[PDB]
Design a protein around this motif. Structure first.
Motif, PDB file in Angstrom:
ATOM      1  N   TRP A   1      -7.726 -25.082 -26.189  1.00 10.01           N
ATOM      2  CA  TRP A   1      -6.320 -25.414 -26.415  1.00 10.01           C
ATOM      3  C   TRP A   1      -5.532 -25.450 -25.108  1.00 10.01           C
TER       4      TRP A   1
ATOM      5  N   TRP B   1      -0.968 -24.482 -33.994  1.00  9.45           N
ATOM      6  CA  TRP B   1      -1.746 -23.556 -33.185  1.00  9.45           C
ATOM      7  C   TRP B   1      -1.130 -22.169 -33.126  1.00  9.45           C
TER       8      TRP B   1
ATOM      9  N   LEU C   1      -6.423 -28.578 -23.203  1.00  9.03           N
ATOM     10  CA  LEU C   1      -5.827 -29.763 -23.801  1.00  9.03           C
ATOM     11  C   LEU C   1      -4.335 -29.829 -23.488  1.00  9.03           C
ATOM     12  N   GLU C   2      -3.668 -28.675 -23.515  1.00 11.03           N
ATOM     13  CA  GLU C   2      -2.245 -28.652 -23.216  1.00 11.03           C
ATOM     14  C   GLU C   2      -2.026 -29.084 -21.777  1.00 11.03           C
TER      15      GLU C   2
ATOM     16  N   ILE D   1       1.391 -30.267 -33.590  1.00 14.88           N
ATOM     17  CA  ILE D   1       0.153 -29.575 -33.276  1.00 14.88           C
ATOM     18  C   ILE D   1       0.363 -28.158 -32.738  1.00 14.88           C
TER      19      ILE D   1
ATOM     20  N   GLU E   1      -3.477 -32.694 -26.509  1.00 13.69           N
ATOM     21  CA  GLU E   1      -3.540 -31.822 -27.677  1.00 13.69           C
ATOM     22  C   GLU E   1      -3.938 -32.579 -28.946  1.00 13.69           C
ATOM     23  N   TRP E   2      -3.836 -33.908 -28.905  1.00 21.42           N
ATOM     24  CA  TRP E   2      -4.174 -34.752 -30.052  1.00 21.42           C
ATOM     25  C   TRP E   2      -5.688 -35.009 -30.196  1.00 21.42           C
TER      26      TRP E   2
END
Lengths: 249, 249
Positions: free
Chosen positions: A67, B67, A70-71, B63, A76-77
């Motif tokens: 996570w 999370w 991805l951020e 998203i 994040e998608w």
């Protein structure tokens, strides 16, 4: 190389420091481990990596690492998919103990194999173990591709590779062959087992392979998904040699 | 009833207080928007909610909200699935502008419709809008169930419901009927369109429903996946009015 895939392992925590194995205990990343995930994401963004899919384990330290990356990538998608077959090695009854506690209850000679061999399975974790309930009561293990009772109670690196393989062959490989850029957020043994298979490393050498945490491990694969050449650590050499030095011994 | 489903919306941003529509612009949650996600997770944990699956949109604010809730629930392992069909309403060329600006370019009577009506579609976004590229150059939309050029260039609340339905019917409904406890991290119009459909709300009555953010919206469905009563807001009855009254101003 016809294909490129990235892999890495989260940063070990407090237990690792005390020479204890977190194993399947679902401990969260500490401050340091969360920083590694971020810096790793920054490193990937700096290399303009665009992932199309992400694979992680069922242990939250694996997922949170993904996570944070991805951020940092602003992706994040990107679909994220989790599996226990990507879980860290199950150390059985040795979960929690340090090196000394292990030799005491099992035998120094007996303990040697369990941590330094490729196929000797440690004794099974039992109902009486302090962490037995916490692992098997968790409802995440009640929705796997195999019933709760059919899951591992202990494992060797060979065992790990054997339950990981099915997942590589059936779920991950098809995606690579499809042109997708994959990211694999794994653990120590998880990543080790997959590298052995893809790089064709022997049972004797797999044990000595260096696996720094928080570092992107680039793998260039050919048409048969076999690694062409050696895996490469991405990032500045300083950060790498410090990370390598940290997973020593 | 026989089935249950939890829905909710992310905390609005700065633009929303300036009475601007973020819409499809992928803005990140602000400090306020993240605390709501957490508190919401704490509220769900407090209610012992166990989710089996999670659906979100492709906009990162949707998203990240999910999370933060999973982290608070210690359910980061629950599979998460994202779709643009869960995206906020596309406000077309009205994306960005504030109330004073919309009128200045269209008309107080014409804009009153595009904001308070159920089926009047705002003008499409043109390749000259400041935020066009920022939205259609993005790769997250080059992997949808419909080609980039076939995506809405603006939408009405009705349009939203029509591109959302396919996803409810084909992907989410089957899982509810399968006994799974679902969580849907959505947006203003997304959540609005879904409730209308499941609760059979009229085109006139739909416009007035109050949809507080950061609040768990429980829906009890019968065998046809139809609402068995009105949706209910969950959590501290104290904080719930803080949510509604704020949405009503």
């Amino acid at each position: 190389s016809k294909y490129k895939l990235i892999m890495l392992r989260h940063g070990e925590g407090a237990w690792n420091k005390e020479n204890r194995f977190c194993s399947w205990v679902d401990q969260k990343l500490n401050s340091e481990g969360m920083e590694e995930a971020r810096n790793c994401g920054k490193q990937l963004k700096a290399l303009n990596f665009e992932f199309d899919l992400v694979f992680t384990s069922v242990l939250n330290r694996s997922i949170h690492t993904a996570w944070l990356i991805l951020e940092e990538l602003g992706q994040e998608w990107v679909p994220v998919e989790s599996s226990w077959r990507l879980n860290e090695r199950h150390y059985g009854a040795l979960i929690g103990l340090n090196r000394e506690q292990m030799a005491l209850n099992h035998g120094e000679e007996q303990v040697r194999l369990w941590r330094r061999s490729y196929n000797v399975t440690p004794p099974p974790i039992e109902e009486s173990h302090p962490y037995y309930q916490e692992i098997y009561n968790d409802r995440r293990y009640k929705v796997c591709d195999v019933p709760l009772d059919q899951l591992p109670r202990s494992e060797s690196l060979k065992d790990v590779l054997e339950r990981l393989l099915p997942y590589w062959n059936e779920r991950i490989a098809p995606e690579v062959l499809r042109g997708k850029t994959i990211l694999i957020s794994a653990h120590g043994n998880s990543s080790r087992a997959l590298l052995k298979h893809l790089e064709g490393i022997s049972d004797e050498d797999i044990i000595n392979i260096t696996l720094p945490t928080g570092v992107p491990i680039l793998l260039e694969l050919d048409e048969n998904l076999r690694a062409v050449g050696p895996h490469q650590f991405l990032g500045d050499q300083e950060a790498i040699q410090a990370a390598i030095k940290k997973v020593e011994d």
